[PDB]
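Handout, section 4.2: multi-component inputs.
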Amino acid sequence: ASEAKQTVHTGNTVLLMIKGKPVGRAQSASGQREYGTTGVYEIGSIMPQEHVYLRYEGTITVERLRMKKENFADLGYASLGEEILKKDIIDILVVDNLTKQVIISYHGCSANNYNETWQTNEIVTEEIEFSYLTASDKA
Amino acid sequence: ASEAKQTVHTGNTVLLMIKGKPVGRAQSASGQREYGTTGVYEIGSIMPQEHVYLRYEGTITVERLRMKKENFADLGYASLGEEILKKDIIDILVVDNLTKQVIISYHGCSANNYNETWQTNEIVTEEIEFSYLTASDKA
Amino acid sequence: ASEAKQTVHTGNTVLLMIKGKPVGRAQSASGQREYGTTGVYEIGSIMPQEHVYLRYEGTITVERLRMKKENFADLGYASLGEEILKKDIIDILVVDNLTKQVIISYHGCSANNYNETWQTNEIVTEEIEFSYLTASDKA
Amino acid sequence: ASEAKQTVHTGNTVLLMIKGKPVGRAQSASGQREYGTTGVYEIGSIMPQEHVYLRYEGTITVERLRMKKENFADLGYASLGEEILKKDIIDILVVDNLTKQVIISYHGCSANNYNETWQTNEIVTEEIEFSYLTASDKA
Amino acid sequence: ASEAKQTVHTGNTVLLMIKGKPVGRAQSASGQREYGTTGVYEIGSIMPQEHVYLRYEGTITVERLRMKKENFADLGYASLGEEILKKDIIDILVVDNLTKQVIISYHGCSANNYNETWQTNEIVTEEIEFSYLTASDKA
Amino acid sequence: ASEAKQTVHTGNTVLLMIKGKPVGRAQSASGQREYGTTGVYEIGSIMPQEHVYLRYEGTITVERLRMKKENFADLGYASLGEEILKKDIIDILVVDNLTKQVIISYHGCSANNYNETWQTNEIVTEEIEFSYLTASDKA
Amino acid sequence: PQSDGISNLHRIALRFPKEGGGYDMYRFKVNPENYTIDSPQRTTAIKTKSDIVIEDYGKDIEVINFTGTTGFRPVREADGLKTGKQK
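Output:
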């Protein structure tokens, strides 16, 4: 029930930290990591005898409501045109609210696609998809 | 509460401008980007060494209720048949309704398609999926 | 509010004219025109430096409730078997109800697919998809 | 209002006939056609010169509640295993229930598939997706 | 209304018999049989002049709620690992409840895929997909 | 009615065990199998002569609410970056909660992917799609 | 005959000389997946300075080529129970 005793993580107990600052007014963050795991088959026997791992296909998507200013592009994480060029590697952390202990971290993200969405009446929403070199953590 | 004091863009506080003129009865203005990022895999390790960019791609989609005059053919953007070859690079902006301050610009566009629907007891619409070279912003 | 003053086109203010007659008891008409627009990329620079246009992929679909007689096939627009052969080019216009001013026109349509649908209890519905040589208009 | 005085076909006023016999407890009778139309593109211009037909394709799908007798196996249309090679060209009509006047005929068909479903507390069904050579009509 | 007089088959009047026993607590059984039927086309004439039949693509899926014991694998129809090997051909029948007259039968089924599904709170469900040599019946 | 006297597995009466330890706050445990069955077709007849197995494939997906401790990284199953190569064959069971009797085992697994979601006012989740060599059971 | 709805399929068999005189008579239990037959001709074409000359010498040696797979499941034999690998 209480924060000090619950067993499960929730949207309200986590902070998303990018380049040392908390992200404001995100809606969801989702991460897929696939090893390309594949079994090794064999003539004479129908079933595979081990799996092996191919490519570390690692991604995180961030969906966010557009802050009036200091959005990703304005504050200097997203980019447009040949700005993509200059934007060196960026680091992201997922953080446990009370203690700000690390939950997990992403050594060196990099942008894939950036989607800003305006619609009739409603709040403006933003989507970014990042691919990273290695995910990691320490306690 | 008020317009000057919120810090998220509601659909209320954004104008959409094109060929230096505001649009009446526009609906959505979705802008999507793909920097074709696909990091180099490398025999001898499981994971990508660095994530690198392979081709810029920029699409902006605008959807609008069909007005009786100054539709996107009358404003000259869209066109029917061969006449498109006579057209030139169109130009689009997203602006603060409260101060007429640019948020972002799309500095060179062309149409992909000009989808239209008439339906029983419904309002007619234009749709345009523009492709564009670059996006940028100042102030 | 009134027809004489509204700014937007609606299902009730438009007539669909085929070979000089109004279409009766249509449900929707939708038209896609895609230029195949594609950007020209370059070694050394990641972004494309212009767009160019490939093929005028132009289509209109008509969905209609089956008139008891004088439907498309009966009246002589749709066809069956080697009748497709004899049915020369057909012209379609979208017409502004009060004045019957042209909204847009399709010089020379041609059939792609024809779908007649019967179902339990309900009204019989018909679908036709047309591809045309050049869309055009005059005021 | 009345049967003789409406001018649209409701599912009430259509009979479905096959091998010169009316069907009990049929549901849908969807008839789809594709004349493979794909106009000639031509180097030196953006748009197709004329739209031309590349292959006729005709499919009629019939869906039916499984009757205890005179199912589509008992009426001989459908069949199981090799026995299909013994079958012949089946023949199908769509008729005015009020006057027993043909609307359209499908002058030569064969089965593609014979999908069936049994489910808990639900009525069983046959489905047939016939392919057909030609469709025509008189009076 | 009554079982002794109704014209239609229902979930409650059918039994599914596998290897001489009734299946308990199934939810649905569905069978697709496709002949690969294809038309033979011709230069000079756009329409096909007959159909021909390619491959007897015959399948039945069985979906069932997991009996506490004596499920498919336990009782000896489904299999795991190199057990698939030993499980010789199996026969299935669809049976008319009162008389246990045959409705249809499947000479010699064979497993394709086996899916056991556990979920929060709810009943455990099982799916098997069988492909068979020849479907057949006798009255 | 009661636990000992029902004869279908409700989600209540199943434990999910992994590395010889029960899991807290697991949700789904879907286990899918494909024996690549595709019977030999044969020129001179329409139908397959016998159905034969071409490659075993076994996937087990587990979905879980993210617990504050003893998540699938802490229990050692999942991992981030190159560290996966240090991992070994994980081992999974499905058990009778009422008697701690095995229903089935998966005698050798490896991870495909480790999908995760954080979202506004929602509970966080882990997802794992394990691949596995074989499944078996005794008693 | 092929499976035509009038007669059941029948499958290929090959007669071999038995080394003591007489024969062995082998037969396939699953028929070929691909079957190809070629009929080459010995016709030749030579081009003279003012005319073409067409010359033929008759039928050439035909070629028969086919490809298939032996069945998996055990199948009874006219004097045994032989599996696909034994066949």
